[PDB]
Amino acid sequence: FEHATTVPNVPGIPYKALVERAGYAPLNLEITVVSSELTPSTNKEYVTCKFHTVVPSPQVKCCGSLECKASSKADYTCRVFGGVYPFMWGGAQCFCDSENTQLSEAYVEFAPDCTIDHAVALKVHTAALKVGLRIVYGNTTARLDTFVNGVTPGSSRDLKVIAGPISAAFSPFDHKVVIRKGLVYNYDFPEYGAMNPGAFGDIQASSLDATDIVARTDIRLLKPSVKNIHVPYTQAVSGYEMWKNNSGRPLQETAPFGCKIEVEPLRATNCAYGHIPISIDIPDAAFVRSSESPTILEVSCTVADCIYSADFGGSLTLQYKANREGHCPVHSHSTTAVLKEATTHVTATGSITLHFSTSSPQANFIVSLCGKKTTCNAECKPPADHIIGEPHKVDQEFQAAVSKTSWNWLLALFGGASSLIVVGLIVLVCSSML
Amino acid sequence: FEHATTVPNVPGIPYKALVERAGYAPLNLEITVVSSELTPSTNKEYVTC
Numbered sequence: 001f002e003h004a005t006t007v008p009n010v011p012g013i014p015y016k017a018l019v020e021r022a023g024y025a026p027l028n029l030e031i032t033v034v035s036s037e038l039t040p041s042t043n044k045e046y047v048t049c050k051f052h053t054v055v056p057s058p059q060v061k062c063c064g065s066l067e068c069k070a071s072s073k074a075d076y077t078c079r080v081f082g083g084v085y086p087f088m089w090g091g092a093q094c095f096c097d098s099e100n101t102q103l104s105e106a107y108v109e110f111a112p113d114c115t116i117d118h119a120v121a122l123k124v125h126t127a128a129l130k131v132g133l134r135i136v137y138g139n140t141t142a143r144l145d146t147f148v149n150g151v152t153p154g155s156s157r158d159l160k161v162i163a164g165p166i167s168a169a170f171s172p173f174d175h176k177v178v179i180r181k182g183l184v185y186n187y188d189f190p191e192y193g194a195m196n197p198g199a200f201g202d203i204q205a206s207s208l209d210a211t212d213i214v215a216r217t218d219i220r221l222l223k224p225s226v227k228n229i230h231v232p233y234t235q236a237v238s239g240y241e242m243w244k245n246n247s248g249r250p251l252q253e254t255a256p257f258g259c260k261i262e263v264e265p266l267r268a269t270n271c272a273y274g275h276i277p278i279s280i281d282i283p284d285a286a287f288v289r290s291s292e293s294p295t296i297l298e299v300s301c302t303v304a305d306c307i308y309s310a311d312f313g314g315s316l317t318l319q320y321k322a323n324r325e326g327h328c329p330v331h332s333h334s335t336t337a338v339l340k341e342a343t344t345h346v347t348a349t350g351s352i353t354l355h356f357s358t359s360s361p362q363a364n365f366i367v368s369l370c371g372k373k374t375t376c377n378a379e380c381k382p383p384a385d386h387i388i389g390e391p392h393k394v395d396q397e398f399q400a401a402v403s404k405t406s407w408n409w410l411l412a413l414f415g416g417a418s419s420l421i422v423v424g425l426i427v428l429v430c431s432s433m434l
Numbered sequence: 435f436e437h438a439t440t441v442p443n444v445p446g447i448p449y450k451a452l453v454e455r456a457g458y459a460p461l462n463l464e465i466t467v468v469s470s471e472l473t474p475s476t477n478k479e480y481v482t483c
């Protein structure tokens with residue numbers, strides 16, 4: 001017997017329901033989400049880190065004009081200097097007086113510590129959910145994990161679940177993200193093949209050990225002022241360190257709906273934003289005969305000290321007139337009230353107490369005990385505690401949020417004004433008759 | 435829970451109250467002033483005999 005419903009997305013906050021076949025007894029149904037991860041399909045453009053800006057040895061020849069071929073190495077900057085006359089230890093290095101040529105070479109390369117201190121640039125497409133459910137139908141615990149696509153049944157021993165598509169997934173990741181050491185940033189990195197000096201992604205490669213390193217650091221070779229054999233060069237600062245200087249806060253601190261970002265794989269676990277349609281096919285082994293279940297001949301309810309809040313605040317007493325011994329579920333058939341308990345053992349002619357949570361100052365909600373429905377009407381007080389450590393289990397519907405007496409005053413003034421208009425118009429009609 | 439109430443300053447004479455909570459049962463509250471003392475802040479001006 002399939003049953004369709006819509007569960008809130010929030011992890012925790014167990015969700016109650018009552019399934020009911022025409023010839024079978026009403027049966028408890030529990031749907032609760034223990035985990036929910038958003039795993040998007042991501043591809044990798046480039047890795048980046050500190051460059052080493054290694055400088056090879058000078059190529060000095062003594063009064064012969066030489067030029068350097070354009071090497072394919074990363075950020076290759078090469079220059080020739082005439083009129084040099086080098087000195088390293090041991091005196092002059094060229095015999096020939098004042099026409100010697102020095103060749104200065106410079107190129108960049110990943111630092112030795114780039115295996116840990118590297119940032120990986122990702123493009124993030126649309127994400128899909130993989131939510132874990134616990135189903136407590138017929139006091140039989142069933143833990144499962146299922147995708148939210150509407151086409152994937154959940155692997156269970158005797159249960160079939162379909163998770164309908166999300167109303168609106170919000171995708172916390174932007175189209176371009178950057179991952180550094182488990183910290184995820186929504187950064188608009190430049191495209192591969194586009195580099196700016198002193199900016200993020202100034203040096204790029206397909207992998208950490210890739211040969212095709214590419215960079216456009218603003219490196220310039222200068223003429224050696226002192227008569228030695230050093231290579232004087234200047235270069236713009238690494239954009240990796242300049243990005244770490246003002247990276248801002250990562251996605252683990254700046255993310256909507258309060259869900260935590262994890263890496264390997266990139267995912268956003270325990271997000272709470274929408275609603276999942278659940279089509280669940282309860283096996284018939286849990287459905288029991290209506291004759292076996294003790295029906296309730298008469299039931300009445302009262303509410304004592306209703307405190308409407310996020311906690312299970314509010315107690316209701318049910319006076320039942322059961323016929324035979326057994327146990328059968330309870331349920332609350334209002335969107336504003338959620339009952340704490342699932343089933344109740346009833347022998348005959350007794351009293352039970354139940355706990356519920358509401359977001360409305362008026363408690364006008366129908367309780368179904370074991371098949372039979374009776375409504376309960378009472379008043380609920382606002383809580384004294386301003387801040388509570390657990391989330392609300394019900395949502396305000398904006399019509400039950402207005403209290404019963406405030407509804408009475410507002411409807412009384414509106415009805416008095418409207419009836420005053422009606423009596424004015426009928427006096428007009430009576431006067432026009434004359 | 436914080437209960438704010440008003441008790442007479444009579445020694446002895448137990449004072450009754452009810453602590454009603456929306457999430458718990460009402461509780462008996464007894465307040466008895468077993469003793470009091472009104473100690474002034476004094477200074478010695480002089481001593482004579």
Ligand SMILES: *[C@@H]1O[C@H](CO)[C@@H](O)[C@H](O)[C@H]1NC(C)=O
Binds near residue numbers: 245246
């Ligand atoms: C950047 O680094 C400098 C050090 O040169 C430091 O003074 C500064 O606070 C950092 N952050 C910003 C936002 O400039």
Ligand SMILES: *[C@@H]1O[C@H](CO)[C@@H](O)[C@H](O)[C@H]1NC(C)=O
Binds near residue numbers: 137139140285286287
């Ligand atoms: C629910 O509990 C009852 C009594 O504890 C037990 O007999 C029954 O097997 C449980 N339900 C199912 C569907 O197994």
